[PDB]
Amino acid sequence: GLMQFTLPVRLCKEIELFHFDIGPFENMWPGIFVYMVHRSCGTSCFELEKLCRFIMSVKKNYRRVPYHNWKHAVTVAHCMYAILQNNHTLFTDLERKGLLIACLCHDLDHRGFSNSYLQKFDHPLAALYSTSTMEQHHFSQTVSILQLEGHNIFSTLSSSEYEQVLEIIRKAIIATDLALYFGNRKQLEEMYQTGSLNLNNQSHRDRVIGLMMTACDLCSVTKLWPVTKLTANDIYAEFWAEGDEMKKLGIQPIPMMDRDKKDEVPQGQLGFYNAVAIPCYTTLTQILPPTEPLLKACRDNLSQWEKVIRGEETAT
């Protein structure tokens, strides 16, 4: 009960900032997550023994892929921590419990392939889940780990609270399907602008939590340029492997996934920042003003990619 996690001073201070990088020391990541749950939720939220066993089983079920890995899970959870800490009074006790766990679990058992590759391969998961294929799998894996003996971090919740928290986690994980993001943001845009956005309307909260999940999931574009640029390499390493696997199925991949077309990456990043990232953080800032640093950092990195194109710097 009286057993706090404390981080070294530079981490203690920087972990509160949106652009925090969790660093290369894997063995500190569980501690960083527990630290974040304790300050965001409380030292009472979870039984430490059960939380630590849950965290280590979650880690075990992330694969050794270049980007969609344990480091991505903890990174996406830290962005959610920063949003919750900068919006103290807007979220319920159950939301704070659920969203950090949802973020940690959102890409469980990812193989580094898109839903589209699963459908073209005719992967069994694509027969079991026709839309948001990988995201229904991630939620399925979350439930599995929660039902291992000693792993039910929610055991002290009531029957109805338990059902509410798993429903928060399910919608939160489904929302990380970027195919659902476009429509979800257009509606939040309309609702905000016509002044009809109501945070007491559960269907409205659902949409806002969905956009927060997109915001955290994309948060590599909100880091300092050297982090953003080095993470882009890992992201494209997965895209090129999928492109290789498309070519093996006798399908020419889109240029984004073709490793012979690396020269088109800078222009592909512009497209992505303009079509997805900037709109995401803009609408998020409108609904939650204290998340403006994410938009500012995203704009700084768009400006860095424009420089790459004008050959004023080369990404190695």
Ligand SMILES: CCCc1nc(C)c2c(C)nc3ccc(OC)nc3n12
């Ligand atoms: C599944 C990966 C989604 C994702 N997360 C980040 C941070 C990114 C970035 C920087 N670039 C992307 C360019 C295209 C794309 O196409 C889906 N997804 C991208 N992406």
Ligand SMILES: [Mg+2]
């Ligand atoms: Mg995902």
Ligand SMILES: [Zn+2]
């Ligand atoms: Zn993700």
